Amino acid sequence: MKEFYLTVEQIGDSIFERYIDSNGRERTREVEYKPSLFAHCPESQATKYFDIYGKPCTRKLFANMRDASQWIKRMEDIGLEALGMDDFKLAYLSDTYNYEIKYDHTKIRVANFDIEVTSPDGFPEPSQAKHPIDAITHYDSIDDRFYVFDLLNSPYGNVEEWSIEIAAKLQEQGGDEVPSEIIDKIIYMPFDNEKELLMEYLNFWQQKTPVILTGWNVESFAIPYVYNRIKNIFGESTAKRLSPHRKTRVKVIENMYGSREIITLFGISVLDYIDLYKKFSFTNQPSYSLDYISEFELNVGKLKYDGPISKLRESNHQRYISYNIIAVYRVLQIDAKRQFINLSLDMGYYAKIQIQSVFSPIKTWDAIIFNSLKEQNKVIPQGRSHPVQPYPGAFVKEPIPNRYKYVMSFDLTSLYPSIIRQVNISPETIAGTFKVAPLHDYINAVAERPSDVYSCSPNGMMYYKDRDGVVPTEITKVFNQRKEHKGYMLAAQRNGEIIKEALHNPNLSVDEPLDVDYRFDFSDEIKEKIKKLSAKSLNEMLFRAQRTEVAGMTAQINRKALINGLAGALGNVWFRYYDLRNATAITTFGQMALQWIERKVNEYLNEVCGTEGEAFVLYGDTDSIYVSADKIIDKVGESKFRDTNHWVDFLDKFARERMEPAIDRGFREMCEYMNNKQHLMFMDREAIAGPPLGSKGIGGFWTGKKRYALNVWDMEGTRYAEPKLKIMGLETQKSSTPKAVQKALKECIRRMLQEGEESLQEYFKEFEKEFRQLNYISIASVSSANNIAKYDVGGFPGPKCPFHIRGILTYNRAIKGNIDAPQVVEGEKVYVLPLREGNPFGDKCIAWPSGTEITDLIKDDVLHWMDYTVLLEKTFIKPLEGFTSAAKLDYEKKASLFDMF
């Protein structure tokens, strides 16, 4: 097989590399890598190395990496550019793996672990590590085993061995319900003292050294705790055995309002799953406790136990250990679904970076571009200092707040990356500038044509047309991968709808789910078999289709994020290729493109309808337009349609056969106007929306920019079995909105769009009457909690104290003195409830850590004093008032002349 790296580090003058050799074996080597850097040289000197602007460079070979670093400093002291890859491990990887990396995940040791630490006096601080580690569960992907290290004797209690037999039993049998599929995979090791546990853990780690190390909160808790505990018990040298190279560094992670410490383990790639989830999931969650996320992702029940976690080991060690094991497994289950580890490996090996570098778009693109240029013997420029400067972004049209009955939307494929490719925007393709007219003049095609030679953006920038820049070249490669995965995602989605349709008529039979590839549209044969399947088999197929769709989503959306990140990186001062001329060339071109096509679409539809000056485009944001289709439907007449699906077909055909070619012609003209390299503005129909045929539903409404709701029948070619609400920006979509209120507001919107005013009024009346029975957690608002200290003045709110922070201060006073009460963590999320006048907490609200029950100390008082009226008005009535006034609807029935009989 082809060799591939696992990890790479620079330690002084050596590269330390762990890798898989040509025989599939894991090896380690220390290499005294001699790096090269570059300086500009005279034109009259034979060289094969040229910078990105075509100027010749001489290669300088250094005796070691320190000499190279020292040369860079001296070049700065002289005032001359020091060119080349200054991150020597990336240059090392580039030299050692000069080919597309083919990796084999089965050879990569991925470890998932979780520790338990009993603590009577509050949260066990990893920096102090003053309490025994009393359980470790460590799953190894090569062995496919859960290694359980269980401490039986501690200063906080001596316990009996954990029983695998009780663990496996149902909770209704007094068991822990450890999933039967992992029972045979558990290797249980009890210990009579912590020193032996830890020594054996280190020996095990030496034998089975993680390459990828993951788990939940491992980077901020488990790793620093284990490292510091071993340090405290045995000394530094022993703790450093967590690194295969015996090198570690305390790394200070700084933010706007403070800092925290993590431990860097040289020769390991830590991918904390909480951080993977935050980066790759495209959710914003009210809580990031593993219980919360596992319930969200997997629909598994919360892990239940009585009493505080600090007493769980002593009271129920059996459950304590089972729950530690289940926690490790839940992360594996989330990864089986989301495939974030697979994604990280794909991206990391593609860029030729340390896998953990996938968190940084700047590092990722720096490596991709370097490798690409090096192929051509080109030499990358030195990174420079730039002051942070704001620059302009997208255009968003101000909509007229209203109901909109029939709507068709259109959206440009991969806009910013397509602009980069079309215009040919790259550091080395800058050709010069032209005299800019106001943007409106380009939008309306009255400005002078910018150039007859170069490719232009309306910000005044011109670009070479003779050859693709490295940025367009490399962005195109990742765009093509994204396109492939999006194809699979959409096929799985369409296949899911086929199964949902079939589920309306399940067969009374015993059978099996079909063995199919859900990434490809079902054949006629498969469709016929599906129509004969039982509900059991269909539901299993639906689950599998949806899992295929999720895998496709992960693969596609994060490649989209990577390419969009390149467009953004051009506007970040830490990027080697930072250039506001290029960043603004992209965004300004986007503004023009949107407004240009709005004009073209309006002109086309005014022509087909025989009107003038009518606004068909009701809204647009960045690269999408929303077109009112009422007049189109009305030209046929609603009475002429057999059913909803009939007019959906008609609009689908109209969009594809009439509007899209008109849109294409419009953009080809704009491409010629800007003299661009290649026409890549591809704007396709996204949504078809409207009320159910014959209903009183309103179909859709806008309240303002970035705030709208649509009843969608077809999205990007997926024809839904049931209409789907597309809701953007409204409170139903915000993590700050109480769970039960999101649900209620969604049902209000559903009724407005699908059923009409009377239906909405019926539901509102009932919600208002019954909502006081809702569980307090479900009606609590949520907020991130920053700068608690700034606003704390002797335990009371200082000037301008935010409402959620006031709530936290209230909570702090109420739990004061109590060492065991859950502390609100700076920067994390809190639930927030308002309090009625005259409550014993002495303020108007209280907040506590999100994803948790409020402590039993104050719960009953919070429940007694909760201000339901304020809750309802703020979270429900106010947003609903916004929706209905925009939609010209009443959520409460107005008096009429009939109220007299």
Add this chain to the structure above:
DNA sequence: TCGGTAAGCAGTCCGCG
């Protein structure tokens, strides 16, 4: 929260005769 801009709403403070 270590890892592009536009723009909405909640809330504070305070003016507004």
Add this chain to the structure above:
DNA sequence: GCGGACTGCTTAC
């Protein structure tokens, strides 16, 4: 009470 200046937070792209 509501709007502007401002902070804080959270979306849509």
